Scaffold this active site. Sequence first.
Site, PDB file in Angstrom:
ATOM      1  CD  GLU A  64      -2.841   1.100   0.099  1.00 57.71           C
ATOM      2  OE1 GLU A  64      -3.856   0.386  -0.070  1.00 57.71           O
ATOM      3  OE2 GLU A  64      -2.450   1.942  -0.737  1.00 57.71           O
ATOM      4  CG  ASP A  92      -3.893  -3.123   2.208  1.00 55.22           C
ATOM      5  OD1 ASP A  92      -3.847  -2.289   1.278  1.00 55.22           O
ATOM      6  OD2 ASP A  92      -4.968  -3.467   2.768  1.00 55.22           O
ATOM      7  CE  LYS A 118     -10.858  -4.627   1.685  1.00 54.00           C
ATOM      8  NZ  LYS A 118      -9.959  -4.698   0.505  1.00 54.00           N
TER       9      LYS A 118
END
Length: 179
Positions: A64, A92, A118
């Site tokens: 990220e 991430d 998710k």
Amino acid sequence: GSHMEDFVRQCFNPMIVELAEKAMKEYGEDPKIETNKFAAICTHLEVCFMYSDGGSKHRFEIIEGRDRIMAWTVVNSICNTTGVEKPKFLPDLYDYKENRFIEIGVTRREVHIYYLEKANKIKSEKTHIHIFSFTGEEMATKADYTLDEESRARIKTRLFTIRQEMASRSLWDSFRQSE
Ligand SMILES: C[C@@H](N1CN([C@H]2c3ccccc3CSc3ccccc32)n2ccc(=O)c(O)c2C1=O)C(F)(F)F
Ligand SMILES: [Mn+2]
Ligand SMILES: [Mn+2]
């Protein structure tokens, strides 16, 4: 120029704001218009950075906060080095200790709903999911929370302070009623 934009800039570190702005413009979005998305991206970014600061020195690769191309470059290097399968969707972090990618989630609803969302999207039994809420709950794949209780408590305290700071400015309800 909205109150939310000014709040974000005083609430978040400048490097975080700059990365969030860059992320949004990478996909054509205006931080000055999509101001709740602005606040959300800054928040998620800070959580990711605090998360990687948990644990030991070389533990996490941070995906990220990079542009699309470099993020996937780093994922490719991680896969073509550890042999872990290449995620269908950009994660991430990568945990060198547990040898798995991490998807961090920050939600204003119950951690359950967002985790299910998710998980169904990536579907990989591989990528580890870790959800934090603005109420201090958390939910993680196989009940494995990766970090210390102390490092997770830091993140939960920060999220609740962001929530109070939004509230004192009468921005919380708009923020929550936008996820
Ligand atoms: C671009 C990458 N995104 C998409 N999207 C992201 C984002 C970034 C720029 C413009 C729009 C949006 C959608 S809104 C949002 C809200 C908070 C934090 C991040 C974000 N994500 C939402 C939740 C995450 O946990 C997360 O990792 C991402 C993320 O990383 C991708 F994976 F698709 F390549
Ligand atoms: Mn991400
Ligand atoms: Mn995420």
